[PDB]
Amino acid sequence: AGEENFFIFGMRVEDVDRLDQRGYNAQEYYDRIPELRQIIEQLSSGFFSPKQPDLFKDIVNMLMHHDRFK
Amino acid sequence: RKQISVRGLAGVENVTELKKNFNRHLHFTLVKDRNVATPRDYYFALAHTVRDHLVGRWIRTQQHYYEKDPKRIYYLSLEFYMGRTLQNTMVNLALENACDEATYQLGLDMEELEEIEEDAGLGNGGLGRLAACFLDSMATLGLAAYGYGIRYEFGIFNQKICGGWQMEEADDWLRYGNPWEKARPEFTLPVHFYGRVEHTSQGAKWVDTQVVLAMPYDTPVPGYRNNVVNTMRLWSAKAPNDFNLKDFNVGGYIQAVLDRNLAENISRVLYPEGKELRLKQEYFVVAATLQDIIRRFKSSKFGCRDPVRTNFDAFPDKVAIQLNDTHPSLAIPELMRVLVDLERLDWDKAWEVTVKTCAYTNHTVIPEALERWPVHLLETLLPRHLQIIYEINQRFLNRVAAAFPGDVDRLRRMSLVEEGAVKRINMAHLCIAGSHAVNGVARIHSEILKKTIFKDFYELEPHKFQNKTNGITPRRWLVLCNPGLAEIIAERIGEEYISDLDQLRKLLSYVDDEAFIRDVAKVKQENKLKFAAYLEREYKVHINPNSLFDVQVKRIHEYKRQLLNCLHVITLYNRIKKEPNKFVVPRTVMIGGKAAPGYHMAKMIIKLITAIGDVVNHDPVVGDRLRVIFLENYRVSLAEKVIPAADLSEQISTAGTEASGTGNMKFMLNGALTIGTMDGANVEMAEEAGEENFFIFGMRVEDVDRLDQRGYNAQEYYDRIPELRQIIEQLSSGFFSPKQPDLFKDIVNMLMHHDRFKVFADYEEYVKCQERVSALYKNPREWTRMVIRNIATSGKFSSDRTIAQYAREIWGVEPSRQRLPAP
Ligand SMILES: Nc1ncnc2c1ncn2[C@@H]1O[C@H](COP(=O)(O)O)[C@@H](O)[C@H]1O
Ligand SMILES: *Cc1c(COP(=O)(O)O)cnc(C)c1O
């Protein structure tokens, strides 16, 4: 198709291998990236869940603290 | 009739009498003979000779509570880790010397026979050890208490270590009788299941329910020389046996041979998810129990003291119940069903009584571990019950609303009905609302309840949330298990300590008396001495008596961290090998404890410990400077051999996790220095003994939240600490596992990339605090004066203190070490 003709992005295999080697910490991205910080805090307040705000709690921790898939 | 008395049948501290009794029971109770008796047999001759006395005073005490009619207390716990009765009974009734002599004059040795008893397998860990202590303290305080649980027939598993892997065999401790128990077929009760609630005219009726029988078994519990003897009453489930033709359900189909075995295995085993049997086991223990509880309120004289309704108004004056952990919560709506539906009160006169009866001990901190049953699951087998929980719920949320008006979100958090995919009933929140007292079991713990877990229950009900720090009996865990240290502490200050433990501060005088200090150190030389030997006799190893007996006995679970301890032992191993001729204090590291089946991490840590064992214990360069031993089938009678022998108690969990920890304590009283993190019951020990008599280390709860805050990243500790990096690469290459290199792949990876508990983080600090430990062991007079200071301070940890605090601030009765009359 041609590389231009394709929206191919993000990490390739090397960088994940290299981030597994240098330890991946999810907090560090959260503290820089500003709309991210914002939407995680939205998920915890229970923006997207008023009746059980608490409900998405495990998606947060999964990400925040223990995500294999980056 | 008056002619039929307890009276003529004894001689008590009398050799010749007990030798006469022993010969009857061997030949008339046992219908055995000297020409035929086993060791197993001479302990049922002896245990029966020691039981006569144990029951004559039970006869007397129970009559004594009917006549005195004291408010009664009932500890509802699904696990009583009793474990070995001959000696606690011999020493709580003071017949040990007289017996030792009788059996001795007969020509058997009493110690032989003592070891044939298999531990009374009705328990599992913390929760259930505790309950067992509280019975010896509650009898001793002359309180009219009771212990009610299930009699498990197969306990929980016995641990076998085969191929350095854990094999779970079955505990049929019930194999040749348990002489300490009495079967009462005649008080069998219906426990009801499934069914439907037919609401008729004046209420609702719970119709069409399967019935299971609850048979009781009575085990007398002797207080310490105060002549009381209470009861632990456990229930054995049993099938109805109409199953053949009587009912016209069978004949044509006995596929309900099933009903029969699903019923018997409520009493078959301990547990060990939302399982229909766990709830069956919970309801079962409660219900047959609440009919004995209400029965005695009617029959124990109070049938002639009715005044009005044989009133259940006089019920919280004269009965008291304890929910020891959410495993009896159904006692609360089981009681509201008995009062409203079966008796006939209105729902407030029924609730007043229930909330004025139930007090519930807590022992959990993490949300994730509070009890929560699915409501459909309560619909099918307990339909009336989940109707009564919903009543409770409506009203409790209307109270809450009277109080925090406008807040809906609090209402939707405090309710007993949790919502998600699969709605559940917060058995935690049931317990709190149906109670006049909630209490953690250690100060840091009770406060985190009020602060973070149970908080909206404390703004609403502040007064309710107390605490009553855990404690241990001194009789099992110092006299019985340590006659030697029992002996020299008697020399310098006499008995009242055994019956009054903060009286051990008197020992702070002797801190520098060279007699004392040779004698505390000598008693320990000899406790280690015999344990080196069973570690040869009953299992195998070459122990060096003269080493730092480093022990760690915990639930083999990730957060308890025997992988922090595995890393320090690989680090001594490496050290002693890079430099074979440096003086490093010789150690015997010993770890023991059960996995609990199917937990794969745990089962791999038990193998890790034995892999390391095999390597260091066969490395010739090492000699006896280092040995790693896995103790197998840790249970109450090992705990009583290993604890006298320990010099270092390793109480190392992640800062913030242990809620308290009953064994923390067992060690202190037995003179062993504690290495451990600032959490649980370390917190009030490092306060009682003064911090510098303690080896407190690591991260504090403070800096664990902090670590989570900037995100713990294991690899950075990996990249600075050079001995760590070394052990990780040893684990992976299969230095410890040569035939399968890749065998510890999971543990490694765990540590390195997803350890919820921050083992690496406490690795520099822990190796250095141990360096300071071997340093102080290298100087016998100061390590012994630390020890004297930790023993002198044990008092804040008697179960006699804890039980007192129960009797006075929750159950409302008064302790008494006064002797009851009897025989
Ligand atoms: N009405 C009573 N009068 C005197 N002693 C009693 C009475 N009821 C029970 N006991 C004693 O208490 C023991 C336990 O009673 P129960 O609660 O029926 O298991 C009995 O074995 C007797 O020793
Ligand atoms: C006291 C005791 C326990 C308690 O475990 P902790 O780690 O101390 O809470 C466990 N097992 C036995 C045999 C005990 O006596």
Coordinates of N, CA and C in Angstrom, one line a residue, chain B residues 220-387:
Chain B
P220 N -15.8 -30.3 77.1 CA -15.5 -29.5 78.3 C -14.3 -28.6 78.2
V221 N -14.2 -27.3 78.6 CA -13.0 -26.6 78.5 C -12.5 -26.1 79.9
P222 N -11.4 -26.6 80.5 CA -11.0 -26.3 81.9 C -10.3 -25.0 82.0
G223 N -10.9 -24.1 82.8 CA -10.1 -22.9 83.1 C -8.9 -23.3 84.0
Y224 N -8.0 -22.3 84.1 CA -6.8 -22.5 84.9 C -7.0 -22.7 86.4
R225 N -7.0 -23.9 86.9 CA -7.1 -24.1 88.3 C -8.2 -23.3 89.1
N226 N -9.2 -22.7 88.4 CA -10.3 -22.0 89.0 C -11.6 -22.8 89.1
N227 N -11.4 -24.1 89.0 CA -12.5 -25.0 89.0 C -13.7 -24.9 88.0
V228 N -13.8 -23.9 87.1 CA -14.8 -23.8 86.1 C -14.5 -24.7 84.9
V229 N -15.4 -25.1 84.1 CA -15.1 -26.0 82.9 C -16.2 -25.5 82.1
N230 N -16.0 -24.9 80.9 CA -17.1 -24.6 80.1 C -17.2 -25.6 79.0
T231 N -17.8 -25.2 77.8 CA -18.2 -26.1 76.8 C -18.0 -25.4 75.5
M232 N -17.5 -26.3 74.8 CA -17.4 -26.0 73.4 C -18.3 -27.1 72.9
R233 N -19.2 -26.7 72.0 CA -20.3 -27.6 71.5 C -20.1 -27.4 70.0
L234 N -19.7 -28.5 69.4 CA -19.6 -28.4 67.9 C -20.7 -29.3 67.3
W235 N -21.2 -28.9 66.1 CA -22.3 -29.6 65.5 C -21.8 -30.4 64.3
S236 N -22.1 -31.7 64.1 CA -21.9 -32.7 63.0 C -23.1 -32.7 62.1
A237 N -23.2 -32.2 60.9 CA -24.4 -32.3 60.1 C -24.7 -33.8 59.8
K238 N -25.9 -34.1 59.5 CA -26.3 -35.5 59.2 C -27.6 -35.5 58.4
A239 N -27.6 -36.5 57.4 CA -28.7 -36.7 56.6 C -29.9 -37.2 57.4
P240 N -31.2 -36.9 57.0 CA -32.3 -37.6 57.6 C -32.2 -39.1 57.1
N241 N -32.7 -40.2 57.7 CA -32.4 -41.5 57.0 C -33.6 -42.3 56.6
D242 N -34.6 -41.4 56.3 CA -35.9 -41.7 55.7 C -35.9 -42.2 54.2
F243 N -34.7 -41.8 53.7 CA -34.3 -42.1 52.4 C -34.1 -43.6 52.2
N244 N -35.1 -44.2 51.6 CA -35.2 -45.6 51.3 C -36.6 -45.9 50.7
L245 N -37.7 -45.8 51.5 CA -39.1 -45.9 51.1 C -39.9 -44.8 51.8
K246 N -39.6 -44.6 53.1 CA -40.3 -43.6 53.9 C -40.1 -42.2 53.3
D247 N -41.2 -41.9 52.6 CA -41.5 -40.5 52.0 C -42.1 -40.6 50.7
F248 N -41.9 -41.7 49.9 CA -42.5 -41.9 48.6 C -42.0 -40.9 47.5
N249 N -40.8 -40.5 47.7 CA -39.9 -39.7 46.9 C -39.0 -40.7 46.2
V250 N -38.5 -41.7 47.0 CA -37.5 -42.7 46.7 C -38.2 -44.0 46.3
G251 N -37.6 -45.2 46.5 CA -38.2 -46.5 46.0 C -37.8 -46.6 44.5
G252 N -38.6 -45.7 43.8 CA -38.5 -45.4 42.4 C -37.2 -44.5 42.1
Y253 N -36.9 -43.5 42.9 CA -35.6 -42.9 42.7 C -34.7 -42.3 43.8
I254 N -33.7 -43.2 44.2 CA -32.8 -42.8 45.2 C -31.7 -41.9 44.6
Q255 N -31.9 -41.1 43.6 CA -30.9 -40.2 43.1 C -30.6 -39.2 44.2
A256 N -31.4 -39.0 45.3 CA -31.2 -38.2 46.5 C -30.4 -39.0 47.6
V257 N -29.5 -39.9 47.1 CA -28.4 -40.4 47.8 C -27.4 -39.2 47.9
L258 N -27.6 -38.3 46.9 CA -27.0 -37.0 46.8 C -27.4 -36.2 47.9
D259 N -28.7 -35.7 48.1 CA -29.1 -35.0 49.3 C -28.3 -35.4 50.5
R260 N -28.3 -36.7 50.8 CA -27.6 -37.4 51.8 C -26.1 -37.0 51.9
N261 N -25.3 -37.1 50.9 CA -23.9 -36.8 51.0 C -23.7 -35.3 50.9
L262 N -24.6 -34.5 50.3 CA -24.4 -33.1 50.2 C -24.7 -32.5 51.6
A263 N -25.5 -33.2 52.3 CA -25.8 -32.9 53.7 C -24.6 -33.3 54.6
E264 N -24.2 -34.6 54.7 CA -23.1 -34.9 55.5 C -21.9 -34.0 55.1
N265 N -21.5 -33.6 53.9 CA -20.3 -32.8 53.8 C -20.3 -31.3 54.0
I266 N -21.2 -30.9 55.0 CA -21.3 -29.6 55.6 C -20.3 -29.8 56.8
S267 N -20.3 -31.0 57.4 CA -19.4 -31.2 58.5 C -18.1 -31.9 58.1
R268 N -18.1 -32.4 56.9 CA -16.9 -33.0 56.4 C -15.6 -32.3 56.3
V269 N -15.5 -31.0 56.0 CA -14.2 -30.4 55.7 C -14.1 -28.9 56.0
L270 N -12.9 -28.3 56.3 CA -12.8 -26.9 56.4 C -12.6 -26.3 55.1
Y271 N -12.9 -25.0 55.0 CA -12.7 -24.3 53.8 C -11.7 -23.1 53.8
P272 N -10.6 -23.2 53.0 CA -9.4 -24.1 53.3 C -8.0 -23.4 53.8
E273 N -14.7 -18.9 47.3 CA -15.5 -18.1 46.3 C -16.9 -18.2 46.9
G274 N -17.9 -17.7 46.2 CA -19.3 -17.8 46.5 C -19.6 -19.2 46.1
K275 N -19.6 -20.0 47.2 CA -19.9 -21.4 47.0 C -21.1 -21.7 47.8
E276 N -22.1 -22.4 47.2 CA -23.3 -22.7 47.9 C -22.9 -23.5 49.2
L277 N -21.9 -24.3 49.2 CA -21.6 -25.0 50.5 C -21.0 -24.1 51.5
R278 N -20.2 -23.0 51.3 CA -19.7 -22.2 52.4 C -20.9 -21.6 53.1
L279 N -21.9 -21.0 52.4 CA -23.1 -20.4 52.9 C -23.8 -21.5 53.6
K280 N -23.9 -22.8 53.1 CA -24.6 -23.9 53.8 C -23.9 -24.1 55.1
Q281 N -22.5 -24.1 55.1 CA -21.8 -24.3 56.4 C -22.0 -23.2 57.4
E282 N -22.2 -22.0 56.9 CA -22.4 -20.8 57.8 C -23.8 -20.8 58.4
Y283 N -24.8 -21.0 57.6 CA -26.2 -21.1 58.1 C -26.3 -22.2 59.1
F284 N -25.7 -23.4 58.7 CA -25.8 -24.6 59.5 C -25.3 -24.3 60.9
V285 N -24.0 -24.0 61.1 CA -23.4 -23.7 62.4 C -24.3 -22.7 63.2
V286 N -24.8 -21.6 62.6 CA -25.7 -20.6 63.3 C -27.0 -21.2 63.8
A287 N -27.7 -21.9 63.0 CA -29.1 -22.2 63.3 C -29.2 -23.3 64.3
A288 N -28.5 -24.4 64.3 CA -28.7 -25.4 65.3 C -28.3 -24.6 66.6
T289 N -27.3 -23.7 66.5 CA -26.8 -23.0 67.7 C -27.8 -22.0 68.3
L290 N -28.6 -21.3 67.5 CA -29.6 -20.3 68.0 C -30.8 -20.9 68.6
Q291 N -31.0 -22.2 68.4 CA -32.1 -22.9 69.0 C -31.4 -23.3 70.3
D292 N -30.2 -23.8 70.5 CA -29.6 -24.0 71.9 C -29.7 -22.7 72.7
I293 N -29.1 -21.6 72.2 CA -29.1 -20.2 72.7 C -30.5 -19.8 73.2
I294 N -31.6 -19.6 72.4 CA -32.9 -19.4 72.8 C -33.6 -20.5 73.7
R295 N -33.3 -21.8 73.5 CA -33.7 -22.8 74.4 C -33.3 -22.6 75.8
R296 N -32.0 -22.4 76.1 CA -31.5 -22.1 77.4 C -32.1 -20.9 78.0
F297 N -32.4 -19.8 77.1 CA -33.1 -18.7 77.7 C -34.5 -19.0 78.2
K298 N -35.2 -19.9 77.5 CA -36.5 -20.4 78.0 C -36.1 -21.4 79.1
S299 N -35.7 -22.7 78.9 CA -35.4 -23.7 79.9 C -34.4 -23.4 81.1
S300 N -33.4 -22.5 81.0 CA -32.5 -22.3 82.2 C -33.1 -21.4 83.2
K301 N -33.9 -22.1 83.9 CA -34.7 -21.5 85.0 C -35.7 -20.5 84.4
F302 N -35.4 -19.5 83.5 CA -36.2 -18.5 83.0 C -37.7 -18.8 82.4
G303 N -38.0 -20.1 82.2 CA -39.3 -20.6 82.0 C -40.2 -20.3 83.2
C304 N -39.7 -20.3 84.4 CA -40.5 -19.8 85.6 C -40.2 -18.4 85.9
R305 N -39.1 -17.8 85.3 CA -39.1 -16.4 85.3 C -39.5 -15.9 84.0
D306 N -40.8 -16.0 83.6 CA -41.2 -15.5 82.3 C -41.4 -14.0 82.4
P307 N -41.9 -13.4 83.5 CA -42.9 -12.3 83.5 C -43.9 -12.0 82.4
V308 N -43.3 -11.7 81.2 CA -44.1 -11.3 80.1 C -43.5 -11.9 78.8
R309 N -44.1 -12.7 78.0 CA -43.5 -13.3 76.7 C -42.3 -14.1 76.9
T310 N -41.9 -14.6 78.1 CA -40.7 -15.2 78.6 C -39.7 -14.2 77.9
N311 N -39.9 -12.9 78.3 CA -39.4 -11.9 77.5 C -37.9 -11.8 77.1
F312 N -38.0 -11.6 75.8 CA -36.8 -11.4 75.0 C -36.3 -9.9 75.3
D313 N -36.9 -9.2 76.2 CA -36.4 -8.0 76.8 C -35.3 -8.3 77.8
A314 N -35.5 -9.4 78.5 CA -34.5 -9.9 79.4 C -33.6 -10.8 78.6
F315 N -33.7 -11.0 77.3 CA -32.8 -11.7 76.4 C -31.5 -10.9 76.4
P316 N -31.2 -9.7 76.0 CA -29.8 -9.1 76.0 C -29.2 -8.8 77.4
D317 N -30.0 -8.9 78.5 CA -29.5 -8.8 79.8 C -28.9 -10.2 79.9
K318 N -29.6 -11.3 79.8 CA -29.1 -12.7 80.0 C -28.6 -13.7 79.0
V319 N -28.2 -13.2 77.7 CA -27.6 -13.9 76.7 C -26.7 -12.9 76.0
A320 N -25.6 -13.2 75.3 CA -24.8 -12.3 74.5 C -24.1 -13.2 73.4
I321 N -23.9 -12.7 72.2 CA -23.5 -13.6 71.1 C -22.2 -12.9 70.5
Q322 N -21.3 -13.6 70.0 CA -20.2 -12.8 69.4 C -20.0 -13.2 67.9
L323 N -20.1 -12.4 66.9 CA -19.8 -12.8 65.5 C -18.3 -12.8 65.2
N324 N -17.6 -13.8 65.5 CA -16.1 -13.8 65.3 C -15.8 -13.9 63.8
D325 N -15.9 -12.8 63.2 CA -15.6 -12.5 61.8 C -16.9 -12.7 61.1
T326 N -17.2 -12.2 59.9 CA -18.5 -12.3 59.2 C -19.1 -13.8 59.0
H327 N -18.3 -14.8 59.2 CA -18.7 -16.2 59.1 C -19.9 -16.6 60.1
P328 N -20.3 -15.9 61.1 CA -21.7 -16.0 61.6 C -22.8 -15.0 61.4
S329 N -22.6 -13.9 60.5 CA -23.6 -12.9 60.3 C -25.0 -13.4 60.1
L330 N -25.3 -14.5 59.5 CA -26.7 -14.9 59.4 C -27.3 -15.2 60.8
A331 N -26.5 -15.2 61.9 CA -27.1 -15.2 63.2 C -28.0 -14.0 63.5
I332 N -27.7 -12.8 62.9 CA -28.5 -11.6 63.0 C -29.9 -11.8 62.3
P333 N -30.2 -11.9 60.9 CA -31.5 -12.2 60.4 C -31.9 -13.6 60.8
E334 N -31.1 -14.6 61.2 CA -31.6 -15.8 61.7 C -32.4 -15.5 63.0
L335 N -31.8 -14.7 63.8 CA -32.5 -14.3 65.0 C -33.8 -13.5 64.8
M336 N -33.7 -12.5 63.9 CA -34.9 -11.8 63.6 C -36.0 -12.7 63.1
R337 N -35.6 -13.8 62.4 CA -36.7 -14.8 61.9 C -37.2 -15.6 63.1
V338 N -36.4 -15.9 64.1 CA -36.9 -16.7 65.1 C -37.7 -15.8 66.0
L339 N -37.4 -14.5 66.2 CA -38.3 -13.7 67.1 C -39.6 -13.4 66.5
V340 N -39.5 -12.6 65.4 CA -40.7 -12.2 64.7 C -41.5 -13.4 64.2
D341 N -41.0 -14.2 63.3 CA -41.8 -15.3 62.7 C -41.9 -16.3 63.8
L342 N -41.0 -17.0 64.3 CA -41.4 -18.1 65.2 C -41.9 -17.7 66.5
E343 N -41.4 -16.6 67.2 CA -41.9 -16.2 68.5 C -43.1 -15.3 68.1
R344 N -43.2 -14.0 68.3 CA -44.3 -13.3 67.6 C -44.1 -11.7 67.8
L345 N -42.9 -11.3 68.0 CA -42.7 -9.9 68.3 C -42.9 -9.0 67.1
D346 N -43.1 -7.7 67.3 CA -43.1 -6.8 66.2 C -41.6 -6.6 65.8
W347 N -41.4 -6.1 64.6 CA -40.0 -6.0 64.1 C -39.1 -5.0 64.8
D348 N -39.6 -4.1 65.7 CA -38.7 -3.2 66.4 C -38.4 -4.0 67.7
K349 N -39.3 -4.4 68.5 CA -39.0 -5.2 69.7 C -38.2 -6.5 69.3
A350 N -38.1 -6.9 68.1 CA -37.2 -8.0 67.6 C -35.8 -7.5 67.3
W351 N -35.7 -6.3 66.7 CA -34.5 -5.7 66.2 C -33.7 -5.1 67.4
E352 N -34.4 -4.6 68.4 CA -33.8 -3.9 69.6 C -33.0 -5.0 70.1
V353 N -33.6 -6.1 70.5 CA -33.0 -7.3 71.0 C -31.8 -7.7 70.2
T354 N -31.9 -8.0 68.8 CA -30.8 -8.3 67.9 C -29.6 -7.4 67.9
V355 N -29.8 -6.1 67.9 CA -28.7 -5.1 67.8 C -28.1 -4.9 69.1
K356 N -28.8 -5.2 70.2 CA -28.4 -5.3 71.6 C -27.8 -6.7 71.9
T357 N -27.8 -7.6 70.9 CA -27.2 -8.9 71.2 C -25.9 -9.1 70.4
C358 N -25.9 -8.6 69.2 CA -24.7 -8.9 68.4 C -23.7 -7.8 68.5
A359 N -22.5 -8.4 68.8 CA -21.2 -7.7 68.8 C -20.3 -8.5 67.9
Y360 N -19.6 -7.9 67.0 CA -18.8 -8.6 66.0 C -17.3 -8.2 65.8
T361 N -16.4 -9.1 66.2 CA -14.9 -8.9 66.2 C -14.6 -8.8 64.8
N362 N -13.7 -7.9 64.2 CA -13.3 -7.9 62.8 C -11.8 -8.4 62.7
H363 N -11.2 -8.7 61.5 CA -9.8 -9.1 61.4 C -9.3 -9.0 59.9
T364 N -10.0 -8.1 59.2 CA -9.7 -8.0 57.8 C -9.5 -6.5 57.5
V365 N -8.6 -6.1 56.6 CA -8.5 -4.7 56.4 C -8.9 -4.5 54.9
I366 N -8.4 -5.3 54.0 CA -8.6 -5.0 52.6 C -10.1 -5.2 52.3
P367 N -10.7 -4.2 51.7 CA -12.1 -4.3 51.1 C -12.4 -5.6 50.5
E368 N -11.5 -6.0 49.6 CA -11.5 -7.1 48.7 C -11.8 -8.4 49.6
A369 N -11.5 -8.4 50.9 CA -11.7 -9.6 51.6 C -12.9 -9.6 52.6
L370 N -13.8 -8.6 52.4 CA -15.0 -8.6 53.3 C -16.1 -9.6 52.7
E371 N -16.8 -10.3 53.5 CA -17.7 -11.3 53.1 C -18.9 -10.8 52.2
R372 N -19.2 -11.4 51.0 CA -20.3 -10.9 50.2 C -21.0 -11.9 49.4
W373 N -22.2 -12.4 49.8 CA -23.0 -13.4 49.1 C -23.9 -12.9 48.0
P374 N -24.0 -13.6 46.8 CA -24.9 -13.1 45.7 C -26.4 -13.3 46.2
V375 N -27.3 -12.3 45.8 CA -28.6 -12.3 46.4 C -29.4 -13.4 45.9
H376 N -29.4 -13.8 44.5 CA -30.0 -15.0 44.0 C -29.6 -16.2 44.8
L377 N -28.3 -16.2 45.3 CA -27.8 -17.3 46.0 C -28.5 -17.2 47.3
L378 N -28.7 -16.1 48.0 CA -29.6 -16.1 49.2 C -31.0 -16.5 48.8
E379 N -31.6 -16.1 47.6 CA -33.0 -16.4 47.3 C -33.2 -18.0 47.3
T380 N -32.6 -18.8 46.5 CA -32.7 -20.2 46.4 C -32.6 -20.9 47.8
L381 N -31.5 -20.9 48.5 CA -31.6 -21.6 49.7 C -32.0 -20.9 51.0
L382 N -31.9 -19.5 51.1 CA -32.4 -19.0 52.2 C -33.4 -17.9 51.8
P383 N -34.6 -18.2 51.3 CA -35.5 -17.2 50.8 C -36.1 -16.2 51.8
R384 N -36.5 -16.7 53.0 CA -37.1 -15.9 54.1 C -35.9 -15.1 54.5
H385 N -34.8 -15.7 54.8 CA -33.6 -14.9 55.3 C -33.3 -13.6 54.4
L386 N -33.2 -13.7 53.1 CA -32.9 -12.6 52.2 C -34.2 -11.6 52.2
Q387 N -35.3 -12.1 52.7 CA -36.4 -11.2 52.8 C -36.2 -10.3 54.0

